[PDB]
Structures are given as C-alpha cells and as structure tokens.
Amino acid sequence: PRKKRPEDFKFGKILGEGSFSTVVLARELATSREYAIKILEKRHIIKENKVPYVTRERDVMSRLDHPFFVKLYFTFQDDEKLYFGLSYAKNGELLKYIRKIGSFDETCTRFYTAEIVSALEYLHGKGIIHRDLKPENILLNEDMHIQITDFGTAKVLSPESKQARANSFVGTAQYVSPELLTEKSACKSSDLWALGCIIYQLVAGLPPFRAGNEGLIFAKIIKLEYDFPEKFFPKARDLVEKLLVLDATKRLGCEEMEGYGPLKAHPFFESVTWENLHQQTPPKLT
C-alpha cells in the first residue's frame, strides 16, 4: 500500500510513554481504523545510542504473525520522528490486573499461562528469544487475549550458525535468568525461567525473587532462594518447580528436554484445548 505519513492520521490520547517513546491512539483517515502508534524522536535515539534497539524492534516484529503478539502493520519516518503502527491493545498490561485483583484463580491462571506458552512455542519455533518477558510486556486486547510486546531487546538467533546463546545483557531483574547473570548469555530457555516467575506471580501475587535493590534479587536468583505460600495450586507449584531450574537445559519446554510437547502435557494443563485458544472466550478475571 501507499507509504503512510503523519497527516494520514488523527491522533487521540497518549496511551503511554517509555524512556524514548510515546504511544498514541490514532485513527487512519482513509480507513477509519484504529492503531496504537509508537513514536520516537530521532535526535534522542541517535544521541542516546538507541538506533540498534529501534531497528531490532522493527526487524523482529516484522517476522511475527501470530494472534498472541502485538502486530506491526506499518512503519514510517519524517525528519524528526520514527513511527510504528501497531495493533491497539485496548485493555493494557496484564500487570494492572494482577495488582487490582491480587492474584488469579486457577482457571484464569491456567488460561493465561496457556496463552503465554502458546506464544513462546511460536516465538522459539522461529528462533527468537524475547529476553524481557514479564506482565508489563503482556498486553491485553479488547477480547482479553494476550498481545506480547517489547521486541527491541529480543534476539533472532542465526539459523545459519545454529546459534543458541545470545550475548547482550538485557532484561528486568525480577525475571532475568541465572544463566545470563552467571554465564553472561541467554538462550530460549531463559524465557521459560521468566514464564515460571510469571506463573508464580499470577498465583501468589508477587514474583518469586523480589527486593528493593536489583543486586539483592540477583543474589537470590543464583541461589534459587524463593518459597511458595502455603496455599498455591499444587499442580501449578509443580509446574513452577519444573521451570525455575538453575540449569537451563533442564527446564520443561526447553530444547534439551524435547520442547513444548512435554510442557503442554504437564498435568496443570490437562483441561486445555491448545489448538484454538485464541478463539476461546477468556475466563473473566475476578
């Protein structure tokens, strides 16, 4: 289609602001479609060494075509700004719901966990590591299905070299894997560690490794220092214990453990119908 330009849109409210970006709700005049447009100031990206992250976000998102990810529909630029035209995730961040309700019941934990698993199976099947998976980066569409975002710190592993490890230090302290901290690289299984943290957080209300200082969190991660609250769905506890494993080759779902089939077969997921999840009505969050 014709390359889009800023004047092809009418902007509405600011949906959010990052360190180097503003996301605005926009309507495209010629179609009346709604988009979330992420806008970055070139001068700021250039001054602050962010060009590789912006180009990575574009490159990674352009590869994805799955219902559980924010879609990148188009990109354009003008003299001052870069623009990404994204699907609008009307219901915002998963984290908002954890905070408000405190935790999720078993049905809701299972459903949202299954969507995240399905998303990770797709991403890992394309040889992509997210590296910053966390509830703030799991958005929710109007129908309350997940829309994973934040790909500027993802990594496409090279198929040509059969690359498995990625060397950049990126992530969020509560969710960062022990291998990145101790070996200085991440792998696809690093996202499975984050998944374990997220499942724990949905059930318990807080992620498992937490402190007021990042270094204190790192020290607990590397020692596997965490505990479960007395009441925690038992099959979910078992699943978390199979994900929060220091040795990245021993996490359920990883390539060395024979991939996503065994993970989808975990007893916590016994009632899940994997094949049409994105067309199922999500359970109401109460």
Ligand X SMILES: Nc1ncnc2c1ncn2[C@@H]1O[C@H](COP(=O)(O)OP(=O)(O)OP(=O)(O)O)[C@@H](O)[C@H]1O
Return the active site residues.
132
Q: Would you say 164 is a known binding-site residue?
A: no
- Which amino acid makes up residue 13? K
Closest by CA to 224, choosing from 204, 251, 187, is 251
Q: Would you say 21 is a known binding-site residue?
A: yes
Tokens of 190: 């690093």
- Which amino acid makes up residue 233? F
Q: How many CB atoms lie within 10 A of CB 2?
A: 6
The CA-based angle 51-165-151, given to 5 degrees, is 35
Q: Applying CB under 6 A, which of residues 17, 18, 33, 55 lies at the interface with ligand 78W?
A: 55
Q: Would you say 11 is a known binding-site residue?
A: no
Q: Which of residues 82-101 bind ligand X (CB under 6 A)?
A: 86-89, 92-93
Number of residues that bind ligand 78W (CB under 6 A): 13
Q: Would you say 62 is a known binding-site residue?
A: no
Encoded one letter per residue, x for contact with ligand X by CB under 6 A and - for no contact, window 116-145 reads: -----------------------x------
Stretch that binds ligand 78W, among 24-32, 79-87, 164-172, 188-196 (CB under 6 A): 79-87
12 contacts ligand X (rule: CB under 6 A)? no
Q: Applying CB under 6 A, which of residues 4, 9, 23, 118 lies at the interface with ligand X?
A: 23
DSSP per position, 31-94: T--EEEEEEEEHHHHHHTT-HHHHHHHHHHHHH---TTB--EEEEEE-SSEEEEEE---TTEEH
Whole-angstrom Cα distance, residue 243 to residue 12? 42
Residue nearer to ligand 78W on the CB measure, 81 or 278:
81
Residues at the interface with ligand 78W (CB under 6 A): 42, 45-46, 51, 54-55, 58, 75-77, 82-84
